[PDB]
Amino acid sequence: AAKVVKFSYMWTINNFSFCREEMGEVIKSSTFSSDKLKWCLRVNPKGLDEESKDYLSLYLLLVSCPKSEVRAKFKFSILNAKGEETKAMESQRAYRFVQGKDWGFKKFIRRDFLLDEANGLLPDDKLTLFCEVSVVQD
């Protein structure tokens, strides 16, 4: 019965089709708090390498903690045009964070699925991501 504390963060990226970031370039969210933990989201619209260039990557970064390492699970999902969390993926288990360290999905969602208006993922050209962080308490 580990003690887990869950919180949810919403980040909306505006005019997403217009993003000019290429492979390797990153968009960072603003910092957010859980308990003295600080986090941010990193998004690579066109991945990080030729490998993942057809995908958007999504990563959770620990910006601040008050001791040495943090143990946490994370779930990323996308808000669709019907109002539903869509394409959720979670860590099956907790990952070890220190300040500066990201964990995430290099291939979080195929670009040509994201850009397909039939999947309703860019309502008004806005990409809305949710991140639920589950921090295991010591």
């Binding site: 990153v26 990193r42 690579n44 990080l48 995908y55 990557s57 990563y59 394409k87 993926m89 860590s91 990952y95 360290k101 990201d102 964990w103 995430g104 999905f105 290099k106 291939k107 979080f108 969602i109 195929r110 699925f113």
Partner: peptide, 14 residues
């Protein structure tokens, strides 16, 4: 592999 998503988790994205 053409998949909408891949579940692998990794780090040092920078």
């Amino acid at each position: 592999k053409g998949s909408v998503q891949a579940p692998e988790i990794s780090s040092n994205s920078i």
